[model samples]
Target: GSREVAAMPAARRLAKELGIDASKVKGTGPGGVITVEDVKRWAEETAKATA
Candidate 1:
């Protein structure tokens, strides 16, 4: 909606594949940009909840 959130390229790609709403993710990277690790962590958390 808002042109997506600013995030690292790889992280953004993974976020898309994981069906994660980037704008809602909390960034842990420099300048508050989301990193690959952030996406992975989010994925893991979501998986745990669903599992």
Candidate 2:
């Protein structure tokens, strides 16, 4: 999808740092905004999956 993912400014940076791959993430912020905490959760899940 060419559409940009919606998330907090810092959250986007955090996702980059955490190496989060989209198409597998779902934000709980309603209107497509992924919370920073959600990013943390996603990072953990991604790491676990990779491991």
Candidate 3:
């Protein structure tokens, strides 16, 4: 399986925690995978919204 797909679950978890719409993010990992970086960015953005 592609790393992107493999990371989906974790990404989704982070998305849920951050209250982000994960489906809207574009993965940049293997095969456009959503790595920690992608999730972290989203998390940061979400954090900023409430800050």
Best by lDDT: 1
TM-scores for all candidates: the values are 0.77, 0.60, 0.55
Q: In candidate 2, what are the lDDT values of residues 1-51, reduced to their tens digit?
A: 226556766667887787785335676565677777788887887668953
Preferred candidate (TM-score higher): 1 or 2: 1
Total clashing residue pairs per candidate?
Answer: 0, 0, 1
TM value for model 2: 0.60
Q: What tens digits encode model 1's per-residue C-alpha lDDT throughout 1-51?
A: 234456888889999999998767787677667889988898888878953
lDDT of 2 at 9: 64
Q: Which stretches of candidate 3 lie over 4 Å from their true place?
A: 1-7, 46-51
Error of 3 at 2 (Å): 12
**Residue 37, candidate 3: alpha-carbon lDDT:** 75
Candidate 3 residue lDDT tens string, 8-42: 67786787787766656666776565766798887
